[PDB]
Amino acid sequence: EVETFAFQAEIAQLMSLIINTFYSNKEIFLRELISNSSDALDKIRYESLTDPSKLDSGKELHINLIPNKQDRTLTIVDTGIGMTKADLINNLGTIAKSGTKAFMEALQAGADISMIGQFGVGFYSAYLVAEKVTVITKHNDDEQYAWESSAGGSFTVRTDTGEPMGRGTKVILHLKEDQTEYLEERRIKEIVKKHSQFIGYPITLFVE
Amino acid sequence: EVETFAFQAEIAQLMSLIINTFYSNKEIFLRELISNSSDALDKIRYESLTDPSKLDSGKELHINLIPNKQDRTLTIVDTGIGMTKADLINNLGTIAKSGTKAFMEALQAGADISMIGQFGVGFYSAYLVAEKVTVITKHNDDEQYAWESSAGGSFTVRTDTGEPMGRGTKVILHLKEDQTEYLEERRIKEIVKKHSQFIGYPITLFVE
Numbered sequence: 001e002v003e004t005f006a007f008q009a010e011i012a013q014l015m016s017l018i019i020n021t022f023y024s025n026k027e028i029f030l031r032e033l034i035s036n037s038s039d040a041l042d043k044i045r046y047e048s049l050t051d052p053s054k055l056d057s058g059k060e061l062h063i064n065l066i067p068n069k070q071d072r073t074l075t076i077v078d079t080g081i082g083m084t085k086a087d088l089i090n091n092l093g094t095i096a097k098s099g100t101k102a103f104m105e106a107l108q109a110g111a112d113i114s115m116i117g118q119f120g121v122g123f124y125s126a127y128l129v130a131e132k133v134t135v136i137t138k139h140n141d142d143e144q145y146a147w148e149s150s151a152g153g154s155f156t157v158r159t160d161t162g163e164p165m166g167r168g169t170k171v172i173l174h175l176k177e178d179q180t181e182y183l184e185e186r187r188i189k190e191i192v193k194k195h196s197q198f199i200g201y202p203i204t205l206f207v208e
Numbered sequence: 209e210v211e212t213f214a215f216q217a218e219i220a221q222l223m224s225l226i227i228n229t230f231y232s233n234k235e236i237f238l239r240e241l242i243s244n245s246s247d248a249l250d251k252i253r254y255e256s257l258t259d260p261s262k263l264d265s266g267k268e269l270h271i272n273l274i275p276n277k278q279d280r281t282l283t284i285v286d287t288g289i290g291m292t293k294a295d296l297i298n299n300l301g302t303i304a305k306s307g308t309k310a311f312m313e314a315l316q317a318g319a320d321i322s323m324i325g326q327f328g329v330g331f332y333s334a335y336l337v338a339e340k341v342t343v344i345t346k347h348n349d350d351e352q353y354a355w356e357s358s359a360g361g362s363f364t365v366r367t368d369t370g371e372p373m374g375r376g377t378k379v380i381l382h383l384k385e386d387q388t389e390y391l392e393e394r395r396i397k398e399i400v401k402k403h404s405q406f407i408g409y410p411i412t413l414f415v416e
């Protein structure tokens with residue numbers, strides 16, 4: 001039981017902009033995804049300050065970066081607040097319709113694609129390097145779900161029955177045939193040091 | 209009926225760091241406060257995407273910058289999600305205890321105070337220029353309240369019975385005797401153009 005959904009017109013436009021525009025500095029995708037994980041972890045930290053039982057589903061708050069050369073994937077895993085089903089459908093908790101409008105209109109005024117995260121749609125930058133993204137998420141108020149898309153104008157949402165993860169979100173990036181450098185230990189270290197070295201949560205680089 | 213509260217030790221430490229450290233680039237305070245307003249407006253936009261009645265208390269989403277030379281104040285007003293009383297008490301909706309720890313430890317590694325907003329405690333930068341900050345806030349799930357402090361280690365929270373504002377938050381900065389340049393039309397234009405020209409909500413500069 002997979003359900004299919006059409007992206008809203010503005011989002012479908014953003015994604016094909018992201019895919020089609022010649023932009024060489026693709027490496028920012030990782031920063032924009034580490035940010036999202038950082039915000040997710042902010043949100044559960046807060047929520048527990050008044051209710052320590054929200055942490056029943058995992059006391060530890062971190063980010064993992066898991067490269068895998070066999071499947072050509074890099075996964076960003078975090079133990080943050082996760083997303084409910086309704087959230088996944090509503091542009092994965094972002095305000096993407098109006099954030100795309102503000103983004104499109106910043107590009108009218110000399111912005112580059114690296115400013116994507118200033119408008120709340122940083123997530124889409126995963127398409128700078130991924131031909132297909134899978135978001136496995138679990139929130140305390142709901143079950144585990146997998147969101148998926150290869151762009152094209154539509155996304156899928158099914159309940160995930162695989163590996164119960166407890167609480168958080170897992171962005172699997174099925175990388176493009178020529179972006180396999182984002183699976184290098186060396187290269188990921190460089191990017192994380194360069195673009196998010198003062199993120200307030202431990203990031204672990206898994207090895208293969 | 210004012211209630212007084214002691215800041216948590218880490219927050220009280222951050223604020224006196226902010227007050228006492230020689231740092232010349234005080235102008236970033238404004239960016240960090242425009243951000244907060246921007247995030248507040250993000251949050252109510254989202255909330256209405258599934259329930260358009262949250263906007264019953266104001267359909268328009270903007271930021272205003274109101275300088276006033278007579279009282280030596282600059283106010284940042286927004287029609288975002290506002291804060292409940294519990295929020296105001298819990299460090300004004302931030303995660304300031306652990307965000308201060310991450311901030312303190314970034315300064316251990318060559319961060320400057322301008323990176324305050326990367327740790328979620330940007331709000332405190334208002335003390336770069338303000339001897340006293342007053343936060344008047346209204347959220348849909350609660351009444352209108354005023355939070356206040358001149359540092360010293362304590363803050364006050366009372367119900368505000370003055371100007372019912374509908375929905376949003378209002379940071380009144382009672383400026384320091386020698387930071388009156390942040391009341392200049394000229395100077396605020398320069399700062400807003402320089403540091404937040406791609407913020408996704410209209411900012412209006414009131415005139416006097």
Ligand SMILES: NC(=O)c1ccccc1N
Pocket residue numbers: 036037040078080082083092093094123135168169171
């Ligand atoms: N790390 C996350 O929870 C996340 C991932 C993709 C989009 C939005 C998100 N909030």
Ligand SMILES: NC(=O)c1ccccc1N
Pocket residue numbers: 244245248286288290291300301302331343376377379
């Ligand atoms: N603009 C606001 O709603 C706001 C102000 C100060 C601190 C936190 C906030 N979320």
